[PDB]
Amino acid sequence: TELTKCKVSHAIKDIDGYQGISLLEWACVLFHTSGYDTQAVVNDNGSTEYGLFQISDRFWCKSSEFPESENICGISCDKLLDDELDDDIACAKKILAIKGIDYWKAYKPMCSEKLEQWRCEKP
Amino acid sequence: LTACPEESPLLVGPMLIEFNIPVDLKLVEQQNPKVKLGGRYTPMDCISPHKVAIIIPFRNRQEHLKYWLYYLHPILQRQQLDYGIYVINQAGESMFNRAKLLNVGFKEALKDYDYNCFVFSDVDLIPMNDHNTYRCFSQPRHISVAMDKFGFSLPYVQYFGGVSALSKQQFLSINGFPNNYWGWGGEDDDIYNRLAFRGMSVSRPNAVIGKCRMIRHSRDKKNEPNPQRFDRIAHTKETMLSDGLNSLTYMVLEVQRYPLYTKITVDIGTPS
Ligand SMILES: OC[C@H]1O[C@@H](O)[C@H](O)[C@@H](O)[C@@H]1O
Ligand SMILES: [Ca+2]
User: Fold this and answer.
1) Minimal CA–CA distance to B146: which of B165, B167, B132, B166?
2) Which end of chain B is more exposed for a tag (fewer CB within 10 A), N or C?
3) Which residues bind Ca(2+) (chain A)?
């Protein structure tokens, strides 16, 4: 499903401030990462990135095309292609604590200024 | 003859834009008798200060083009513009390179007429209000401000994708657009970066006047998300001086003059 900035913002509220990244920065990051599409599937040289957070099967989740992945998140990548974000979030948090925000290449170029526009004002 | 009014008296405002009733280019020509070979039109009633080349990046979307032509020709004439339509067809099967095709459109159009304004438009966007003039302004102009694809809203303030217009001078100022973005994404953010570095701001009509409708389509295997897009965008400041109009190379495989447009098929090379 292609979510709205506000659907996304409400759904990932739990990640706010984690590792020092605000919800505004995330709303920005997720838009350029997946267009807020919970079913986004992208190829990246031999690897595949899944869902809203574009979590890669290279190290983070277990896919059928790469069953020997380290699967640091301990989750099947297909679980990252649905509308239930709790597990996506738990995985994103491990990526943030282990690798850091720079896993998301859009952060620096697209979300270093003009963050206010990313605020969701919808209760 | 006298100069055309700052605003055309022909404008209709909001329009119903639909993609059902198949269109017949022959009919479109029938309905647009003032448009001359190659898709050129110049007002007979007044003199327009807007000499606009409308550049459309393209690859196997003839069905989208028919609707684009069907809707835009009447709109552009209403807007009283001295314009020409150029479809830049990317030959081959490499990943789509939108920005480079747009650079080709600029150079090629200039061979035909002394245009002073260039409108860059994807084939699948149709404006819903003819007050959204397809011409150039004192600052770079972002035209497709409120597309349905984004819930009739601007997705982010730095967005300069879809349809835009740059005066010849604004284009030259940023050394044109990048040639090194293959596949989907980022090239329009790079352009936005170039404009900002040359000290320009983006001019836009409001979200009501700027509504546009997008003709839907399925993922394009020839235009998969570009993995390097983010690094490229992050370095525009340095690469804009070496990648753009000044470094553009391509081979024209055919120039086609149809009654409703000029289609230039080109070989723009491959990723390197
Ligand atoms: O689709 C909207 C815009 O989204 C961005 O994240 C991409 O980098 C742009 O190329 C695209 O035009
Ligand atoms: Ca999930």
Assistant:
1) B132
2) C
3) 79, 82, 87-88
- Closest to B162 (Cα-Cα) out of B56, B37, B5: B56
Tokens coding B99: 């920005």
Q: For chain A, first and last CA: distance in Å?
A: 21
Question: Could you give the domains of chain B?
Answer: 1-272 (3.90.550.10)
**What does R_g of chain A's alpha carbons equal in angstroms?**
14
- 8-state DSSP, B2: P
**What is the sign, positive or negative, of the torsion defined by CA atoms of B52, B53, B56, B57?**
negative
Q: What number of C-beta contacts closer than 8 Å exist between A and B?
A: 29
Which residues 6+ apart lie within 8 Å of A122 measured at CB? A6, A10
Give the β-pairing of B51-58 and B82-90: parallel
**Shortest Cα–Cα distance, A13 to chain B (Å):** 20
Task: List the determination method.
Answer: X-ray
Does domain A1-123 fall into CATH 1.10.260.40? no
Backbone angles phi, psi at B52, to 5 degrees: -105, 125
Test A110 with B155 for CB contact under 8 angstroms.
Answer: no
Neighbour tally for B145: CB within 10 Å = 25
CA angle A88/A94/A95 to nearest 5° reads 85
B230/A117 touch (CB, cutoff 8 Å), yes or no = no
Domain boundaries defined on chain A: 1-123
- Resolution reading in Å: 2.0
Q: Do B105 and B192 meet the contact criterion of CB atoms below 8 Å apart? A: no
